[PDB]
Amino acid sequence: CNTQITLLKKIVKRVTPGQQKFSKTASILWLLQQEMVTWRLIAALYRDRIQSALEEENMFEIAAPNASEKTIVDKLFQRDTLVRQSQLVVDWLESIAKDEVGDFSDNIEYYAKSVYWENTLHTLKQRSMLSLGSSRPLVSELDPDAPIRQKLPLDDLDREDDIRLLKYLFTL
Amino acid sequence: QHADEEREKTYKLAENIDAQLKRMAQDLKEVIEHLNTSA
């Protein structure tokens, strides 16, 4: 189905596979995506159900002190029964999100995002050359970190760049 | 030890590389100028 979706994208890519002139086709596409999601959820849930039916001989546990987090989560998994489906859905949706993201490192490298920005670099260069405090104040105690430490406001360009960086971090 | 000898040889080789690249770039510039003024 993924191969067929890629082929259909390569086909309809010459007549705008989106925009506004794409109603019933987009509906069929989203229905097929939901069908694939339901199939994957069914597969995962029934695999977990078969595993639980096979390991049903190990049940009725208790919390034991002086142990490690691995043994703690193991005994919690053996005791509780809803944590099974909870972590199953969690891992399934995490894998779905990872597959939808793909390779974001190359996208970030092409977008070129870092800590220091052009506005901050120009402000530092101007303050090192002359004494013109343009935009927000940027004091430097032998290192451009005093405003970041004191939680001082910055420029609009730096603010929007940080907003985009945090949006990318949230997407990751 | 052959380490210090190799390091000195590499330094001399880099110096010769620079001194030869300078004159080679000058010669290429002169040759291209002559070709442009002749053609």
Partner: protein, 91 residues
Amino acid sequence: DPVFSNMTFGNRRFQDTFNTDPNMDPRNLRQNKVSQQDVDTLLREGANSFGESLQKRLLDIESLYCKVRSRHSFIQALVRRIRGLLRVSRV
């Protein structure tokens, strides 16, 4: 300057004639000029032309259209890189 290195055009092995000529040469007419003031004036004129109207136009264009082929979405990256390279100066 070491910043003006390399001359490969494209992913393939392509070459170009010369790079920087301190004297008057016809290759300087094909490449950049021999004066930094010309590049500075070009960058200043580009930054002056890249006003709020053109920025809003490009934003509306990128919002109403998002490519049509397969080449990875780089619209915002190109926009920000062009803005930075137009507002920065060359050394």
